[PDB]
Design a protein around this ligand. Structure first.
Ligand code: NAP
Ligand code: NAP
Ligand code: NAP
Ligand code: NAP
Ligand code: MG
Ligand code: MG
Ligand code: MG
Ligand code: MG
Lengths: 250, 250, 250, 250
């Protein structure tokens, strides 16, 4: 319904937030290609949402530049012209700036920053001037707004994603590309990422962190992405959309 | 559909943005009471959207404090317990801070600030702890983010609404009131308000103002309000939602 | 030294932050008039900093509009043309939006908002186009950035001051008035205001509030005001300056 | 005077903003080591400010990780324990996100992001827990707040610097390291960087960009850095300091 005729690429769409985004996208009429590095997890994820007439899994590392062009070619051949790109693939490292190894630093930014750049850049090139009502949704974080003492590299990547997206949004708007670029800034969401962050759920459920006294679910982010992907938000570009249970409000 | 069982008060719902919010709210299954100071315009506005089974007009000035209590009583009698409050009623004065008369200053703030406060305060008192999935949507502006040399009082009011709403959102969250509070920050939208601002449409359509090269329509704001009113945004509180064609992105 | 030839009005300069601003202003060569409602405290405050050749007390309520004109006339007669206005006079009420009486609401805003407006508006009219390197410094807060569940009216006032100042700054800049307008956003500072907020010092000293593990002192705000008052910041206008021990960084 | 006993490393201190920072730092009593890639420009710069008793040039690429440790060792041997680190070295590329080569992307981020990370990380390790009143000043930009259609990679780096610094500031504060971390966000400043951006000065001097109708000078940024380096700002950490002639205010 709300995403009629839309064709979406959702990176890291096999687990957590990305899975829910893909799930709700298909539910609203969109055709979706999800990516991930693990094929077994990926195929199970895709089949869990629907058949290959609406959703397909493509194994792809978001930091793999050459693979991005093939990903677009695959999606377009399968479903027609890509209209929506969700740069969701991302990882977290639990290290202060002081304690961050250069290897940790480079690896996180390769995925969280370079991966988003690859998708956004190619997304603009491929979707511009085609009357698709194209939408690029880049997954930032509340960590793109505020800092965390043990998420140094993570903070850097999300701050980068936040502002880089504004540049793309402006360029597309000024050149009448019919492409919108926005960022989503989830608070803490119950996902495998958060499960891997030791004690994060109990600590961030505290009122001093999340005022609602609990963390969110992947569907909380799926629904704001549906809005941004749909023509409902045709006047929304370059903006930041925060779903965080009040985290950044205090 | 998306607003099933919701009962909404939309202040200033007889023209422009408020009218579209009411229009789309009814479309998504909500019961709506719209307010305005002019009865002739108001009654015509309500009938243009639907019958009295889904929408009714109530004559009410948002700055009328005593009237707010009667408004809630009237809405509740007609449709049952209020679940949604859209503090949308607002006015603009085209004056620099330097050139603003104290009368202009007090009158704009009476409506834009005191009115939003009256609605938010009573909204919390009336909707808390009732499992309604209550949502309070306060209409700020891009003028709550950036200044304009000829919108002094307006800027003050929208900045106040922006941050006051965060206070309410936090209070409701920490006390488990089941009430969410968010602000919407429209860019320039084609409405009687903008029509009353001499030459505003052509000037704000310039790329140096709105990068998309045009201003928005009332439906652009209606749809984000639908999202905030719905249980889809159950994890969104204390946040700011900007639909401005890229105005604040540059 | 750093404020040579400057003539400053500092509202609420008899205690706390305002007192320190006046103290350091005089130290850096400026002539200062401090205001307050209590004459006994005020006269003692002025004499504690210096003689009437550098600082004088004038009894004046910031919400007294007519009194503002006489204040400027008095200051100018004593020290020559005013070059600097610090709208610092402000009060706090410890109430949620829900629990705020309309009387509390109107009174806080009368001082914190209308007072700042009166000073800013007249400040522009009186200091523009005189080559004074004029600076208007409006005292907002971290509560102009984030909300607090028990500072509803306060949050509104500080958000208003934050954005209204931008309007004034832009107007002055575009019209080449040689007047700059900026806002200062202190975190929690050890003052009679904070002392009047029951238990505020111990609670806001907690790491979850102020990361430095303590609140600030009035001199912390004095020194950033000295910078904004001086010609050192001749390229700074419409901006927000935060001294909060990291409060808003998390 | 204001920087008594301070020992500063200023990366890219041989031209533009960095040169002025070094100049004013020495003027205020600090000992300074400036870096740059070109030795001839570097030595001329250092000698132009003072003798080797107050300032020395060290040839160093900010993206050279191993060189950073030697830089700290050199500075400390020459002047005693480092107290201040100004991560100022940075470059700009005039390309939209769409038109940005991966090489351009990687090279800019290597300097503007990785360089700042190297300096901040080592800065914390070397200056913590020594009672130095240590200050880390990371040079972001207005391009870390808003986007520009032809500064894609640049926007990314400055957004990254903006938020990464907050993480460091929090960690240092919570662990009582006696190290502060803040970001400076200059508007357009007359420097060789801006001269290399074709037509940037005339375009950004337009009122629609910089409201003051002109761009700034390197000293405008030097003076805010002096404040941040001095003990005057001992309560300021994790914050953003904007000197932009009103650019981001509209
Ligand atoms: N969960 C939160 O609290 C939260 C909060 C704010 C922002 N975010 C952001 O939302 C995004 C998703 O978060 P999440 O919690 O859902 O993470 P997640 O649960 O761990 O799932 C991440 C997904 O991305 C895939 N992936 C991981 N690395 C990849 C790579 N290099 N290339 C392609 N795909 C990759 C993963 O599959 P494979 O491992 O098999 O590759 C997985 O399907 C992230 O960008 C995150 O930064 C999350
Ligand atoms: N249009 C924009 O570009 C724009 C941009 C950002 C934010 N906003 C905000 O969005 C809100 C609505 O904007 P708008 O453009 O649609 O305004 P509008 O076209 O002029 O319509 C305002 C509506 O509010 C009613 N109203 C006016 N004063 C009232 C009062 N004291 N009490 C109750 N109702 C009142 C009006 O009806 P009556 O006159 O009969 O009372 C009218 O129905 C405003 O708060 C505005 O500040 C608008
Ligand atoms: N202290 C903090 O933690 C903090 C944090 C952020 C922002 N601020 C802001 O910084 C400003 C000063 O704070 P503060 O802590 O130093 O307050 P304070 O300790 O209570 O002192 C307030 C000063 O203003 C005067 N004053 C009060 N009401 C006035 C009025 N109507 N007209 C003129 N003068 C008046 C008071 O003298 P009289 O009573 O005799 O009139 C007093 O000298 C305030 O605007 C506050 O909102 C403070
Ligand atoms: N100018 C503006 O309008 C403006 C506005 C906002 C932010 N900023 C930021 O302020 C900082 C300085 O700006 P600027 O205008 O003064 O630039 P600039 O005039 O071109 O000077 C940059 C200085 O850094 C040195 N440098 C360049 N690349 C380096 C590297 N890889 N390693 C070490 N040193 C290096 C340069 O010397 P060598 O070439 O010999 O190496 C030069 O001395 C930058 O981070 C910039 O992003 C500038
Ligand atoms: Mg990199
Ligand atoms: Mg916070
Ligand atoms: Mg009033
Ligand atoms: Mg702007």
């Amino acid at each position: 319904d709300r995403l009629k005729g839309k064709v979406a690429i959702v990176t890291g769409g096999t687990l957590g937030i990305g899975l829910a985004i893909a799930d709700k996208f298909v539910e609203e009429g969109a055709k979706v290609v999800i990516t991930g590095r693990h094929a077994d997890v990926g195929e199970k994820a895709a089949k869990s949402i629907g058949g290959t007439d609406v959703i397909r899994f493509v194994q792809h590392d978001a930091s793999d530049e050459a693979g991005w062009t093939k990903l677009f070619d695959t999606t377009e051949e399968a479903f027609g012209p890509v209209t929506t790109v969700v740069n969701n693939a991302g990882i977290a490292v639990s290290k202060s700036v002081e304690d961050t190894t250069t290897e940790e630093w480079r690896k996180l930014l390769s995925v969280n920053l370079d991966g988003v750049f690859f998708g956004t850049r190619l997304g603009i090139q491929r979707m511009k001037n085609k009357g698709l009502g194209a939408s690029i949704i880049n997954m930032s974080s509340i960590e793109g707004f505020v800092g965390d003492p043990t998420l140094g590299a993570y903070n850097a990547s999300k701050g980068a994603v936040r502002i880089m997206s504004k540049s793309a949004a402006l360029d597309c708007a000024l050149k009448d590309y019919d492409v919108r670029v926005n960022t989503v800034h989830p608070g803490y969401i119950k996902t495998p990422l958060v499960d891997d962050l030791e004690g994060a759920e109990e600590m961030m459920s505290q009122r001093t962190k999340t005022p609602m006294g609990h963390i969110g679910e992947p569907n909380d982010i799926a629904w704001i992405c549906v809005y941004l992907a749909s023509d409902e938000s045709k006047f929304a570009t370059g903006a930041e959309f925060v779903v965080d249970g009040g985290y950044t409000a205090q």
